[PDB]
Symmetry: D2
Subunit: 329 residues, 4 copies
Amino acid sequence: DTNIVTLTRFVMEEGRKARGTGEMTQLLNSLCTAVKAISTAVRKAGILHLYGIAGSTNVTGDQVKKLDVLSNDLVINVLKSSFATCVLVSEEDKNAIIVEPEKRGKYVVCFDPLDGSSNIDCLVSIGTIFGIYRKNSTDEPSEKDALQPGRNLVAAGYALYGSATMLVLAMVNGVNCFMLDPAIGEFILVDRDVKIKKKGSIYSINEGYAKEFDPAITEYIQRKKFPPDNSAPYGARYVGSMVADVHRTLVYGGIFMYPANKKSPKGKLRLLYECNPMAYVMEKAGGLATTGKEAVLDIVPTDIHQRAPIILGSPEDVTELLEIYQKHA
Amino acid sequence: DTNIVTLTRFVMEEGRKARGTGEMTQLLNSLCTAVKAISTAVRKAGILHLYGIAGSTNVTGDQVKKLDVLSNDLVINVLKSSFATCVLVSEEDKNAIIVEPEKRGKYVVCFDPLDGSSNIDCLVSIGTIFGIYRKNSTDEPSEKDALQPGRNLVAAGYALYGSATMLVLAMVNGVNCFMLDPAIGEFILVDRDVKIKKKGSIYSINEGYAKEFDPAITEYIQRKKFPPDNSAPYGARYVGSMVADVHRTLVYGGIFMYPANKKSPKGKLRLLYECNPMAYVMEKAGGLATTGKEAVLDIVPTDIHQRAPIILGSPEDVTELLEIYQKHA
Amino acid sequence: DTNIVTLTRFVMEEGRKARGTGEMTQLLNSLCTAVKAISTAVRKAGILHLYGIAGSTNVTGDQVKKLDVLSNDLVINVLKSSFATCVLVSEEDKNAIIVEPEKRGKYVVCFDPLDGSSNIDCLVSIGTIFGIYRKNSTDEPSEKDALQPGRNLVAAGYALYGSATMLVLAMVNGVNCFMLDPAIGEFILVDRDVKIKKKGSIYSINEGYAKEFDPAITEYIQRKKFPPDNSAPYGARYVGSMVADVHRTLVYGGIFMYPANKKSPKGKLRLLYECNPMAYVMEKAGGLATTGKEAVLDIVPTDIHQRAPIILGSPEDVTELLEIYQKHA
Amino acid sequence: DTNIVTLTRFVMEEGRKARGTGEMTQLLNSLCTAVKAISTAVRKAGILHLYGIAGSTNVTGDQVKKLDVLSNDLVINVLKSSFATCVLVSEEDKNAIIVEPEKRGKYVVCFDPLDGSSNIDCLVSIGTIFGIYRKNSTDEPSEKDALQPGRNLVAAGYALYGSATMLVLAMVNGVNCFMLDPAIGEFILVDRDVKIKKKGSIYSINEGYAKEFDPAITEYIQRKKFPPDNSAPYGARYVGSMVADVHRTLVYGGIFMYPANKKSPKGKLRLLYECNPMAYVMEKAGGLATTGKEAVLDIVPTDIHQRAPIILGSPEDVTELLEIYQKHA
Ligand SMILES: O=P(O)(O)OC[C@H]1O[C@](O)(CO)[C@@H](O)[C@@H]1O
Ligand SMILES: O=P(O)(O)OC[C@H]1O[C@](O)(CO)[C@@H](O)[C@@H]1O
Ligand SMILES: O=P(O)(O)OC[C@H]1O[C@](O)(CO)[C@@H](O)[C@@H]1O
Ligand SMILES: O=P(O)(O)OC[C@H]1O[C@](O)(CO)[C@@H](O)[C@@H]1O
Ligand SMILES: [Mg+2]
Ligand SMILES: [Mg+2]
Ligand SMILES: [Mg+2]
Ligand SMILES: [Mg+2]
Ligand SMILES: [Mg+2]
Ligand SMILES: [Mg+2]
Ligand SMILES: [Mg+2]
Ligand SMILES: [Mg+2]
Ligand SMILES: [Mg+2]
Ligand SMILES: [Mg+2]
Ligand SMILES: [Mg+2]
Ligand SMILES: [Mg+2]
């Protein structure tokens, strides 16, 4: 046990193939430090009096929590000091953050410092989501640099603060899971080249929105409960934190859904720092991610805080739902 | 911050009122040690290779996981060395465990060493549930000592290994939450005299069993989705771990349900170490816990592993469901 | 590894022999909590900005450090809430602290909340020392209750914050070492019935006081450096923290000395909370502890802060020094 | 507290000045991981059963301890995976270790995986020492690459596992101290541009070697005990672990000595991984390090395990001893 395969070694030994400037490793290294700090505070939030609100409303509705601010500050700071980023997009910040010339790098990072706001106080799993882009312009860095389709992602993933803290990282060639060892403070590889099952047996959605669901979603759920071929009905799971439900979908298979509805044409989840990163992870794992009409990763954003419906998980499950939408179109 | 209000001080300063032998404090102290050990292993289960099965089937169906065995061993051992117990009942053990004469105490403890088996590998919140009884007999200790109705509980609660580890403890006069501070290894009081809201806005149940639900449950869910008075529909949440869903119900209010169905006359959850402890906590917090026809705490068990349907949470929500059952009776 | 032999179990399973009120276990339990808190802060004192002075001078000369105050507060508080003490004596407090009637127990505790003041800022090992007496009076508790000879100790020991944190505990039948496992926050038994070697090969004293040493000490040191029988000279060690040097003497054997000198008739170390506890530990381990003229444990104190010369360690080494004193008398 | 100034940021933001390949940061990053792992095991060595011998004798006399092997393995592995080293020299390895072509970097690292062997079992402070050189040759990497005078060091320091774990790092422009925060597993800057006092009041040496000391050392010690100008005698301190005694000398000032003697012409401490790193740190802090006749950093080694006498600390103290040697020459 004297040869620790940390996330840093893995990535460094990864980018070795395509010998680069090595700033991706600097970036992920910095992010890991922020995630460990968030994890430490979360595991003892009540003792630190970190539950409750901070007294503010972000770019859209959400009532800002104390952990939102703390985690947001930690991420912004480590990313800047990494000398690997130039444009930062955060759920908590109205406008994109342009990194000062002195600490600029070539990457653009979109992130949700803390996902699962509604589950903080009840101690349910929460997390951090991020998507990383390569600046594809010569002009001065600006918000436009973050308005790229998810297909242009070079790296994406999330930190899940669940029963254990896990950092799930996806890059061009695959998905790997690294678990944080609290004792030495290192993320250690525990799952290599993760692939999602072709078909699962769990569906995840907030059925409290039944009244607003479109005919397609309605039909699909009914089918999951009453299989036309007498097969066993799917089990239902909905933790309430996107990071938790998506991670379960990844390792157990099945489908996760936050579709558009009669009151929300574009669903709720944010495209830049919620939908695209998860869609990217899902596809590198052999899964699918759709709005119900088009691939999430192919949407070209016009607003860093725009929303997007999302249906992701096992290919056969997502495809089954797609056929329903096509049928009702 | 030099006056730590630990669970031990709290209880000790509690039992002071009714000056006893002090073995309840010894018992809870021992249990806290087991819970801290479980929490430590869980937060790093993958690194310790604790995911997966152990190769056995407990008293009923459940496929035994590695953490089931580890947690079960830890609990049995600390309880025995506490010199405060005489009869132990565990989900993992076919028959009751009689404590050797040398280490016998007056309490009977029923527990689920690790609840949320299906959510272990996906890193979703899991926990430990326990119920404590006072031996009300003169005969040699036996399994019969554990066959008491939940109303005879003198203490009950659970350890939740969620975003933070919390030990929720209920006794005759109330419910208190203690959070584990990983740094010093002490459970610290963070929530005093917890009370559940009279009415919530979240319903929690596995709707994958829609085909097997009785008319009452079916009507209630439909009502939560389509309120007859145009009020906002309830939100849906179902983590999949009883300890996680019940804790959210406690702090946020609402209702949790694992009713009987066409294939399970007595539901799934176990009365002794799952239903009664949660029912007890719920009632000391001002909530209700019913099978749909009778109070869970009033059932007189005949099998230490018998099952019982359970509906618990905010009084007004549970009562609303009860009226439906009565209506359909 | 599911049967943790903690200090609590050990003691509880110890006092079982002479079934008592069990408050000694409550007392040691409380003390363990304070020691874990001190250990946590010490391992990260610089990050917490706990180095430096607090701006005060205790009962005698010593310039009060920030950790002196923090550790003192923690110990006082846990001891009071233990319901096992009535009179407290601390190096940091001018007068004895009488516990309020409501939380009174039968034990008297003398302690040095933090020993090794001069080694704090250089990160050298430091610790906590304590001696416990049974109140042998009917009168209201007072300072006089702490003025008992060390031979009346019922328990004594120290917490060493060295490369690892160790709690060394001595009672009527022996000495045992318990190491703090930072991960679960429990002191675990690692050394049972510790006994010191009859003769060692290390001498420990501050030779910077050569000019003030009496003829006996001078002769002994010279003999350690130039053995009259051509044996190998003893090695010298002097960490500067009594707890560190005494612990090394215990496990490696040898001698530790802080004798009286031409400017300090009664040495420097305090009898109540430094000399007696270490003398007690030393004797229960088969060692000796003398002033050079009389056994430390036999001195009847008249001042809770009085000083006493001390020579302790392997019997043959201490006896050799005693013969020198007798020779020069 | 959301802007953590870690060792990594510091160094990275340091090497920024002289924009390099950045592999020094990779190297220090890797080393930090090994040091955290060693620190974790040390703080709980007894519980892990890591005390005792491994059953082997290194390059010279020393009886190999279990922690020697563990720490040695950890350091070798992290250094290799860093892609920043080509030649490794370890106290535990008879010959230099040549890094495989695939993972070669430009630095040569000499280190003592665990210093203070004799103080392990008594829980006294121990540590890790390292010195880093830049390969100044075109030939294939070999042992000769490590045979450079200490003046060619580009970085050196040590990890002290004392009351707190501290990583002291010296480079061309100065010395900085970083303390390990066990909670998040990051070394945090706590002391910037450290400078040693010009004159101290503590002398540190094993006086058990009085019989073998040369006239100069003998005279100096006598002078420290009996000041010719009636000034206060110096205090004596000798922990027994070079890393602990040197760190105290650095922060408190004074002198540390392990001179040659009648039986050891070149002292005991090893030049490559003990003397040079400490001499380098000492000089960057404004101190001195001599054999008594020549500067340690100017010695050109001929054996990777050769020994060297060493006298270091406050300039005025070291100079005073030098004048004595010159006087006796
Ligand atoms: O309560 P709702 O509408 O189901 O929203 C839950 C979703 O919202 C989020 O909290 C984002 O705000 C996701 O983490 C989660 O999937
Ligand atoms: O998958 P299902 O049938 O919803 O069962 C989930 C329930 O089973 C349990 O895992 C008990 O086995 C509970 O913790 C949880 O509430
Ligand atoms: O610096 P001196 O005089 O050797 O004193 C050291 C002694 O003083 C103490 O720090 C007590 O104040 C002991 O821990 C230690 O043994
Ligand atoms: O016991 P001695 O001869 O004083 O040796 C102590 C010295 O040896 C070392 O342990 C090296 O082996 C140093 O850490 C320490 O300074
Ligand atoms: Mg939000
Ligand atoms: Mg979110
Ligand atoms: Mg968020
Ligand atoms: Mg089970
Ligand atoms: Mg269960
Ligand atoms: Mg279970
Ligand atoms: Mg003092
Ligand atoms: Mg002291
Ligand atoms: Mg003190
Ligand atoms: Mg050695
Ligand atoms: Mg060494
Ligand atoms: Mg060594």
